[PDB]
Amino acid sequence: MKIAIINMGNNVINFKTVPSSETIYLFKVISEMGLNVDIISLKNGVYTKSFDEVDVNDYDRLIVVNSSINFFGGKPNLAILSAQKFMAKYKSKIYYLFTAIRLPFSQSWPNVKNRPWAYLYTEEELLIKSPIKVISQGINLDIAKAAHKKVDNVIEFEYFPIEQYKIHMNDFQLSKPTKKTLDVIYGGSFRSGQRESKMVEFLFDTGLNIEFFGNAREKQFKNPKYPWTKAPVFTGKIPMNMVSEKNSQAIAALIIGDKNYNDNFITLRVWETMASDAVMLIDEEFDTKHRIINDARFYVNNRAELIDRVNELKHSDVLRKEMLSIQHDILNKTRAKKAEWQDAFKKAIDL
């Protein structure tokens, strides 16, 4: 029973990019699950084997982490091309991990064929014909179906909380009490639409000492629909394996909703925040039924609530430590179901 996992459009090497990090972490939990798996990427490396040195059919299961197939600058992207070439060669069912709503499986061929460099690839090389099973991180399978209407070889859908991969790691560790230098923190990237609207709502013009780390930049928030005067401080990106420690520098860390994610997906951020030394504050819209934690104090409806909640935390160290104690307990309750999570994953990939 040999398993192969690949990222469909991003080179995998270390934890310096989210796509690479996610692929490696998934590789790790699958291995720790007692399964034989290899990550196949562009070149051999610490965690990977290269496409050019393995036969895709020496594997019994092919797992693919979602990615975009857009060609930056209209030029060839080997990460995308080599992965799809690998996928098109596979003759069994493909398991597509849907962790980002905007990244549904898509064929690169229709795009490539009209490129000036189309001479480099044939339809047979890139056209993926194997049946595909979408493993949706979101509980709402209709959202997954809707996103995959343009591809007809996707004939199965199943929900699985993929994002719990960090908390089930053998070396997982809660963050310890950390000296506070921030009131609120958020580590991530800029995204248009509702996410943008909400980032402005919860992180801008708050009057609090807020930091936004990651790939975001103040200049990206220029939509007249979401006006702001004072922005939070933006700092650079850090490796994914240091996110919870970074979150810990703040009194509170935020979970912000987005269209189609609300009451559907639980995102990696939820666990990274819950496991940190920062109190987890959640955008009410993201989890209206309070499925994450049945305690209203961890939820903020708007900029006003956030400000008050944060002040309440700044004014009562006991309240802060109490909420941390509770979120940490709730986190471990999910961690205690590791065996169930592992069994559900195996079932998801027909094992």
Which residues make up the interface to Cl ion (CB under 5 A)? 100-102, 243-244
Span between the terminal Cα atoms of the chain, in Å: 9
Out of ligand UPG, Cl ion, none, what residue 107 binds, judged by CB under 5 to 8 A for its kind, is none
Dihedrals phi, psi of 315, to nearest 5 degrees: -85, -20
- Token look-up 């493909």 returns 94
Tell whether residue 99 is a contact of ligand UPG (CB under 6 A): yes
Instruction: Provide the CB-side half-sphere exposure for 60 (13 A, CA).
Output: 9
Q: Facing residues of 48 across strands?
A: 39
267, interface contact from Cl ion, ligand UPG, none, CB < 5-8 Å by kind: ligand UPG
Q: Kindly state whether residue 187 participates in binding ligand UPG, applying the rule CB under 6 A.
A: yes
- Asked whether position 272 contacts ligand UPG by CB under 6 A, the answer is yes
Do the bridges between strand 94-98 and strand 61-65 make them parallel or antiparallel, or are there none, so unpaired?
A: parallel
Q: What is the phi/psi pair of residue 261, to 5°?
A: -90, -40
Nearest residue (beta carbon) to Cl ion: 102
Closest approach of ligand UPG to the CB of residue 53, in Å? 28
**How many Å apart are CA 233 and CA 240, to the nearest integer?**
20
Under rule CB under 6 A, residue 274 binds ligand UPG: no
Name the binder of 323 from ligand UPG, Cl ion, none, CB < 5-8 A by kind. none
Residue type, 31: S
Does 22 help bind ligand UPG (rule: CB under 6 A)?
yes
CA–CA dist 338, 346 (Å, integer)? 12
Could you tell which of ligand UPG, Cl ion, none binds residue 268, using a CB distance below 5 to 8 A set by kind?
Answer: ligand UPG
- Residue 244 site contact among ligand UPG, Cl ion, none (CB < 5 to 8 Å, cut-off depends on kind): Cl ion
Nearest distance from residue 122's CB to ligand UPG, in Å? 33
* Cα 102 to Cα 146: distance, rounded to the nearest angstrom: 11
Residue 216 CB, shortest distance to ligand UPG, in Å, is 8
- Does the footprint of ligand UPG cover residue 213 (CB under 6 A)? yes
237 binds ligand UPG, rule: CB under 6 A: yes
- Residue 139 in the binding site for ligand UPG (CB under 6 A): no
Q: To the nearest whole angstrom, how small is the minimum distance from the Cβ of residue 210 to Cl ion?
A: 20
Chain centroid to CA 116: 33
- Whichever of 109 and 271 has its CB closer to Cl ion, that residue is 271
22 binds, options ligand UPG, Cl ion, none, Cβ within 5 to 8 A by partner type? ligand UPG
- What dihedral angle (degrees, nearest 10) is formed by the CA atoms of 335, 340, 342, 346? -160
- In whole angstroms, give the CA distance from residue 151 to residue 257: 27
Cα–Cα distance measured from residue 90 to residue 201, given in angstroms and rounded to the nearest whole number: 46
Q: Does 100 bind ligand UPG (CB under 6 A)?
A: yes
Give the whole-angstrom CA distance, residue 171 versus residue 266.
22
| Contact call for residue 232 and ligand UPG (CB under 6 A) | no
In 16-30, which positions are buried (b, 16+ CB within 10 angstroms) versus exposed (e)?
A: ebbbbbbbbbbbbbb
Q: Considering only residues 267, 276, 327, 334, which one is a binding residue for ligand UPG as defined by CB under 6 A?
A: 267
- Give residues in contact with ligand UPG (CB under 6 A): 18, 22, 99-100, 137, 163, 187-189, 213-214, 237-238, 240, 243, 265, 267-269, 272
